[PDB]
């Protein structure tokens, strides 16, 4: 009875909509809560195994389901779930429903609107990492499907980052947004729009100055390197901003910045590198003489990289005078055996590259 | 003179670190003091012995609130002051300031963490570089750690050390013959003393800690009877109760860092020996 | 030398790698402009700073302060217009603190501007900032609007209000947030007719914003808007928006409403508070979110106080009371703590009889609350119940609760109750302490935790102060002297600490007659610690002591202490002798 | 330089390959194990997902410089070149009975001295089989970056890092070039000997308007990731044999493992330099640590 099956689909949608969720008392309506869980599982297996089970009437009820069971104001961040299984079932149900080939984005474009996207985005600040992962996947699918909403999504994410970097400096979902944005970047057109350049300069670069760079550092580095791959021209400003945003007090942040500049130099172009050696190597000479052994080890691993050697040997005359004083002073004073060996190896390479 | 030391102690009491010149002056005076006493620094009853503060400065403040403040309370410390660098510099400075200010009232032993390599590994050197930039503070405190006494003899009847018994040594005269002014290796009687642990299995056993030698109950018993030791006290091993008894109640382990790493939630304990050398234990939770 | 030599060294410092050198130069710009000619600073120095100065965040912050201070150096209000462009770029800088302090300095220098100068230069600056492409300039202009408005012509006032309307409709939520923040001030500057014409639709639109932050900021602006409006039109204009915000889905909006509840009640008037604010407050107390419930709790006492005298009792009993009872048994600890902190002040408001009938059982239930800080809070403000009702009715129930709170396993609870105890002594009376609480004090003194002991000593000072010296003389002195005989040295020196504390308040004769003999007796203690603390005690109590007794007994004992093997006792004895001038 | 991407032979690191095949009741199973050395305690090895036993190969080389002892590198079922009767089955108990049958097949009659080293899920397998105690002769267990709570917390980070490279690689030299470029494998020869078994031969860019593929599918692993790490820390501490753990960061340890370590139950060493490929980022350092552990515990004798 396929028509009856779809009507029972709608009825179970209504049942899962009403207050039979795990949020309510598990003991009260316990059979109801359990049959709600089993109903979500049955819905998922039904829409997986069966085909052509998505009709125009279906979309509003599932959208209302997602809004009711998910679109709520985030709980207070008392930190300086019992209902989680049902919520996770809702997440995976919605995810597969989007993944359904029978899904038609044009049909759902009325049901999924800018308000829906905005409430989904504000959900991203949830403390649960699993919640953030599911939301990340959901937003990625939505952005992939809906072409029209993409500009609004980008603008709303830009607003979220502006509030984060300038007003609140407290957002748990930064990493997920960053990786989604990187996925978007990979598909950017070769001539970058002025909106994209403004996004890079005014948003991502200020992310570095944010105190909690550690939690979202790899994703930010990936986005930056993706832009640098997209356009070589944008490399020159960004690195100086990197120098401008360089921290003078936190050694671990210095290690993180090293990492980023290492990837940048891995993807750098010689024409930009000849422009940007002097401040970069000034900061690097400060770092090699920095008392912290980890930053020193990272800056010495810089010499281990082949591409960095090649680029430095390309223009020895400018780099060498900056490196010589810090290298000589570090030659005079050294404590750790590993750092001593690394600095001496760097001295040997510097003697080889020029005398 | 002593006025500067008192002002420095008050500064540290306000959770404010001292300057490089003050640090080096304190290290020099502390070295002068430490050169005087023997490896087995005898201590007279009464005294309060604590476990491993492990750099939680505010936990040390709670400890002083619970047991009194120097010089009102004679304090004996097992060691391991340098640890995860939350506020390890502050507590190390405070202890050395107390020691220089009150040579008799405060006695501090050398924990196995008190080595240059261990300080660098556990971030204490990183904490020094974060706080001061210059590595000179770390060098001065490492040099001071070289002078720290290895063991303590409370009233001649109780033996105290950060680790445990060493197979190479059966008499206190052996430790007295040892030289403490050197970097502690991963071997030798000094490292065995610093890293040993009490174990139920009889006899000397290879330590799973990576250094020292685990010893049986009969090992501790025969050591005590040979050296006339009423009791053996130690640290470096956690107790959820804060204080543990083992080896026929001849070995007692004391830990003084409550909720070590702020995640374990273990209670901390301190052992006070009164005038009549009667031990008692007092337990406390981490400060808010 | 060079005429532009200060400018030359400024250029060098900008070129100089040392940012600290630039910071020092920026700080010393005051002296530089003092030495430099005023017209020289206006001609080049200000354009130089506007054009080529791109410094670090704190350096630009100091620069903003220095430009704010250049009101006099520029030549007074005559040339402050030339100061505007230097501050303009400083408003646009991406950092937030720099633009905040820049707009603060702009507001400060606005007053110096004459109305003709204000219209000529400052209003075009505000227009440029509001029309600036980046949202940060609009954020800065939001603050400027209020100080700009009052002194300018009516037509330019209409232009300014139109620009504010445009900003409040901006797409970027940050600009809307800033506009909502400055809306109350701008309404204050505006006249009443234009306020009704413009702010109320503007305020309603901001309250209906999708973003919760904009809505909660509109909630804050609602207080100022209600203050400006006449009470009669509050029902028609601002009240429905207040009700809509009170029932917002977001818990943050309801949190903001609860936080500003008392101010809203005061501004709106008593009648509208009775007719509309009471049901909203009842909903807030029964709100699903615990944080909103706690916030509403924190404002309970003030809200009850601001209620009209005639109906306050009936309103609280009929409507507020049941919600109070419900929240008494609330699951959340923070909510119960806040309620216990605030619930009591309702007792004078309702009267003794009403407190006894309903409030008193609530107090009894709150006393038996498992969580400690709740009992601490109810103990805290006990003066209100003390005055409103008899002390015996409260005391008979408190005494067991005080007993278990004092004997708590956690030492911090004991420390808190000891800290709180002297107020309880003053309220309950001397006999009430003597019959029971003296044993509690003795247990605290003999407690193993030192912090408990020192808190007990301070409490003892407060007790002898409140209850007179003779009461402690009859009771406290014998027990503190007897407690010195403890075998453990720590409890023994606790007596010395008690003597040090009590000597100041007790008096000279009582000092000489009783505890001086005990201190001299313990001066011969075997432990070095007790001995040097005896020396410290003699040092502290010497000024109170008579010179004849000091020479007769204190001096030989101090001399003997000086001649000792222990270095610390020697030092302390010598220091005490020097301080007392005996030696 | 370092432009040579020819895969190094297994012969240098492991003297012999034996593809041990045993026919269980379910069917024949081939194990593709590597044996090196003449005499000495067996160094049983276990690699994590997306890796091979040959990834340990350079590590193996390091340790033959340190301590003379028989070395056995085992390839996991459905991983590497191992031929499996039931590729779909990946149960933890199945893995334990698998490695027990491997030990029985290799010698069975006389069990030589055998100590276990595991990386990523390989460490979890080593812990599980130590709890099973199927091996009659046990000396010591070592895991590298194997913590239950942290693994459950950081599954997605490892999945993303492994998925960073493209799924289809035209040549093995292309994969080796990717490894040397990305820095995941510090040693070029380690990469050469690793990818050869890591891959097999047959999240998405949002556009705006046969090559070597992954031998291991991340989907099935993530499906079964939760099962392997269940109760890992408690079973690890339940092990009676001595243990040694190496981790990049001391803070990365879980509360239970931190309490057990500081209590003195097992030794730890911190090597911040190692990142994603902890065992192969600094193979010499971890090899020296293992040699020191063996000589201290007298399980194996030095050269």
Author numbering:
A (entry chain B): 34 to 113, 128 to 402
B (entry chain C): 6 to 293
C (entry chain A): 7 to 589
D (entry chain P): 37 to 238, 251 to 257, 283 to 376
Which text from the study accompanies this structure?
PP2A holoenzymes are highly regulated by carboxymethylation of the PP2Ac tail, which is reversibly controlled by PP2A-specific leucine carboxyl methyltransferase (LCMT-1) and methylesterase (PME-1).
To define the structural and molecular basis of PME-1 interaction with PP2A holoenzymes and dissect its multifaceted activities, we determined a three-dimensional structure of the PP2A-B56γ1–PME-1 heterotetrameric complex using single-particle cryo-EM. To trap the enzymatic intermediate, we assembled the complex using the fully methylated PP2A-B56γ1 holoenzyme and an inactive PME-1 mutant, S156A, followed by covalent crosslinking using glutaraldehyde. After extensive 2D and 3D classifications and careful separation of the tetrameric complex particles from the unbound holoenzyme, the structure was finally determined at an overall resolution of 3.4 Å. The PP2A-B56γ1–PME-1 complex adopts a pentagram architecture with a size of 100 × 100 × 90 Å. The PME-1-bound holoenzyme has a similar overall architecture to the holoenzyme alone and maintains the majority of intersubunit interfaces, but exhibits three major structural changes. The N-terminal 10 HEAT repeats shift significantly by increasing distances of 4–12 Å from HEAT repeat 10 to 1, resulting in a 12 Å shift in B56 that alleviates the steric hindrance for PME-1 binding. Most prominently, the interactions of the B56γ1 internal loop (IL, 110–130) to PP2Ac near the phosphatase active site in the holoenzyme (right) were abolished in the holoenzyme–PME-1 complex (left). Finally, the methylated PP2Ac tail no longer occupies the A–B56 interface compared to the holoenzyme. The PME-1-PP2A active site interface remains essentially the same compared to the core enzyme–PME-1 complex.
